[PDB]
Amino acid sequence: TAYDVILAPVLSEKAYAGFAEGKYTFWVHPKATKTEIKNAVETAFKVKVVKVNTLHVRGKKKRLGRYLGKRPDRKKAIVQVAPGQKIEALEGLI
């Protein structure tokens, strides 16, 4: 309840380029308002939240023998810096 926490970083391939020079791609709480994202991102990270884009994608085909299922909802959102700062560690990383 009011734990500001709302994310799991996007480490996907293309996601990379952005980490390389400006836009960092992350996974966010499925429902985290765009202004919400500015809040979380800016506050937790000491960053410069410019253009926060957002997309959602549910999952599919995973079979369990006699029956099957398909995963939950993976929520995607990507926000860009201002000068190139913050997320450093993260980026050199993935």
Binding site: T1, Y3, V5, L7, A44, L90
Partner: protein, 67 residues
């Protein structure tokens, strides 16, 4: 660490507040850790959750007891 249980008891206002806030954040740290050490980390995560759960249960105790 029912001892942590104690510390919990102890704190209260913007105290418990900021304390739980920060710690939760630490757990965020954890979440990010999801892809690094991970091995001895497991606990840190399950537990950490648990612990903040504590903090919370407490604030309820404290201020609800109040009003």
């Amino acid at each position: 660490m029912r001892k942590q249980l104690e510390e919990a008891r102890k704190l209260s206002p913007v105290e418990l507040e900021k304390l739980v806030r920060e710690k939760k954040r630490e757990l965020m740290e954890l979440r990010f850790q999801a892809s690094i050490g991970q091995l001895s980390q497991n606990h840190k995560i399950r537990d950490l959750k648990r612990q903040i759960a504590r903090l919370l249960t407490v604030l309820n105790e404290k201020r609800r007891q109040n009003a």
